[PDB]
From a paper:
EngA is unique among GTPases because it bears two consecutive G domains, GD1 and GD2, followed by a C-terminal KH domain. Our results indicate that potassium strongly stimulates the activity of both domains and congruently that of the whole enzyme.
The first structure, EngA1, was obtained in the presence of ammonium sulfate and GDP and was refined to a resolution of 2.25 Å. The EngA1 structure contains one sulfate ion in GD1 and one GDP in GD2. The content of nucleotide-binding sites was also well defined in the electron density maps. Crystal structure of EngA with an apo G1 and a GDP bound to G2 has a global conformation similar to that previously published for B. subilis EngA with GDP in its two G domains. The EngA1 and EngA2 structures also suggest that the GD2 binds either GDP or GMPPCP more efficiently than the GD1, corroborating observation made for the T. maritima EngA structure where a GDP molecule was found in G2 while no nucleotide was added during the purification and the crystallization of the enzyme. However the GD1 and GD2 affinity for GDP and GTP are similar in solution.
Author numbering: 3 to 29, 41 to 60, 67 to 121, 126 to 205, 212 to 435
Write the structure that this text describes.
C-alpha cells in the first residue's frame, strides 16, 4: 500500500538501486522485491534539464508517500543536487536522503541539503541498503488514512464538552470571507479562497444523536483528530477557567509536534475589568508552561466578538509550522547567540558549535553539530531556541533542536 519513489539528477545510480529493490510490475507501479522484509510499492518517474527533473519530482510529490532523494557521493553536493533539493522543499511528504557510491569527510555538505541524515549506499553489494529502507519504512505509520491535496490546511478544535466548539465552528463559517463546500466526518471550506479542512466535525455533532455517558471515548477521538491535523485549536471556557483535563489533550498536541493556538471562548460571560484579560493570560502560561509559543485569543462564539481573529491565527500558526529557514542566516543567528552568552563548561571542556542546519518541517527541527553533545544542557538548548524564535518568528509552533557529534 505505501508508495515509494526515487528522485534525483540523472547519473547518480537511481536505476541500479530501483532495479535491486523492485519486484514484479503490478498490471508504472512495481511491487517491492521478494527478499525485502518490508511491504510497499515503487513508482517509476522516468518517461529540457531543470524542467525535466522538475516533472519527475512533481510525479513523485503527487503519487508517492515517501521519497528517496539520491545524490552521488563521489561528486559531492553539486549545484544540480541543490536545485533538486529546492524543488523538493515544496512537499510536506517525507524525504530520505541517500548518498550513492560511498563519507564523514563532507557530512555538513550533505546535511546542507536540508533533509537530515544522509544514508550511504552502494549499488554493487547493497551495503547501507538495510539502514536506508529502515529510515523509509518508519514513515509508513504516519501515512494519512484520509488524503487531501497538499494545498489544503487541516485543523481541529478540541476541548471539554460544552466549551463551545460547535458554536465557534458555526460562528466562523458564517463570515463573509468563508465559502462552505457544495468523507462525511470533515468540513471543507475556503477562506479568502484558500482551502481548509476542519477535522472530524461529525464527532463534534455526535451529541444531539447520542447521550454522554463518559468523556473517555470523546477524548480518545480528539487525539485521533489531533494526529490528522497540522494546527490544533485548544478551546478553553472563560466562565469556569482552566481544569485538569484541559492539560491532558494540550500536552498531547505539544508532544505530537503540532502547531497550537489557544482560544478562550465565552469571553462575553466573564466578570471583567481592566486587568482580567492579562491575568487570564498569565494563568494560561502558568498552567500550560510547555505552550509558550502558542498565541492566546479571547473571543465569544455568542456575540461574535473577535471571531474574525481565529482564521488568521490558524493561517499564521500553519505557516510557521511549515517554515524552512536559510542555512547561512541560521548560522549567523547561532554564532550571534554564542557571542551574547558563552557556552557551558564541564571540568576543562567547553561546548563548541561548528555548524547548524534545519532537517525537517512540521514542526521545524534543527541539528547543531558540536564538540560533545553532553555539554549541551537543556537550559542552553532553550536559550538557543529563543534566539532562533527572536530572529525568525515561529509563533504558533514548537521547534526541535538536537546536538550531534562529528
Ligand atoms: N455566554 C456564551 N455562551 C456560549 C458561547 N459559546 C457557546 N456557548 C454556550 O455553551 C453551550 C455549549 O455550546 P456547544 O457549542 O454545544 O459546546 P461544545 O460541546 O463544545 O460543542 C451552549 O449552550 C452555548 O450556547 C459564548 O461565546 N458565550
Amino acid at each position: 500500500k505505501p508508495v515509494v519513489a526515487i528522485v534525483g539528477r540523472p547519473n547518480v545510480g537511481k536505476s541500479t538501486i530501483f532495479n535491486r529493490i523492485a519486484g514484479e510490475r503490478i498490471s508504472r507501479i512495481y511491487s517491492s522485491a521478494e527478499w525485502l522484509n518490508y511491504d510497499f510499492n515503487l513508482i517509476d518517474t522516468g518517461g529540457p534539464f531543470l524542467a525535466q527533473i522538475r516533472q519527475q519530482a512533481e510525479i513523485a510529490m503527487d503519487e508517492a508517500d515517501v521519497i528517496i532523494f539520491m545524490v552521488n557521493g563521489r561528486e559531492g553536493v553539486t549545484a544540480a543536487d541543490e536545485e533538486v533539493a529546492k524543488i523538493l522543499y515544496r512537499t510536506k511528504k517525507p524525504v530520505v536522503l541517500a548518498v550513492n557510491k560511498l563519507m564523514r569527510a563532507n557530512i555538513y555538505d550533505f546535511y546542507s541539503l536540508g533533509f537530515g541524515e544522509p544514508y550511504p549506499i552502494s549499488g554493487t553489494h547493497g551495503l547501507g541498503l538495510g539502514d536506508l529502507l529502515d529510515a523509509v519504512a518508519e514513515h509508513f505509520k504516519n501515512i494519512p488514512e484520509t488524503k487531501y491535496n497538499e494545498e489544503v490546511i487541516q485543523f481541529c478544535l478540541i476541548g471539554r464538552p460544552n466549551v463551545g466548539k460547535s458554536s465557534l465552528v458555526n460562528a466562523m463559517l458564517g463570515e463573509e470571507r468563508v465559502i462552505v463546500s457544495n468523507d462525511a466526518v470533515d468540513t471543507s471550506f475556503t477562506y479568502n479562497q484558500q482551502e481548509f479542512v476542519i477535522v472530524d466535525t461529525a464527532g463534534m455533532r455526535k451529541k444531539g444523536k447520542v447521550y454522554e455517558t463518559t468523556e473517555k471515548y470523546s477524548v480518545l477521538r480528539a487525539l485521533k483528530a489531533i494526529d490528522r491535523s497540522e494546527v490544533v485549536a485548544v478551546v478553553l471556557d472563560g466562565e469556569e477557567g482552566i481544569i485538569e483535563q484541559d492539560k491532558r489533550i494540550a500536552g498531547y498536541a505539544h508532544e505530537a509536534g503540532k502547531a497550537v493556538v489557544i482560544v478562550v471562548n465565552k469571553w462575553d460571560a466573564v466578570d471583567k475589568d481592566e486587568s482580567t484579560m492579562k491575568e487570564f493570560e498569565e494563568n494560561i502560561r502558568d498552567h500550560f508552561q510547555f505552550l509558550d509559543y502558542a498565541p492566546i485569543l479571547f473571543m465569544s462564539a455568542l456575540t461574535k466578538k473577535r471571531i474574525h481573529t481565529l482564521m488568521p491565527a490558524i493561517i499564521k500558526a500553519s505557516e510557521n509550522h511549515s517554515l524552512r529557514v536559510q542555512t547561512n542566516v541560521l548560522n549567523d543567528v547561532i554564532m550571534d547567540a554564542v557571542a551574547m552568552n558563552p557556552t557551558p563548561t564541564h571540568n576543562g571542556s567547553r561546548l563548541k558549535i561548528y555548524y547548524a542546519t534545519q532537517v525537517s518541517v512540521k514542526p521545524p527541527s534543527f541539528v547543531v553539530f558540536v564538540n560533545d553533545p553532553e555539554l549541551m544542557h537543556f537550559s542552553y538548548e532553550r536559550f538557543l531556541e529563543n534566539r532562533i524564535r527572536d530572529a525568525f518568528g515561529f509563533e504558533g509552533t514548537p521547534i526541535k533542536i538536537f546536538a550531534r557529534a562529528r
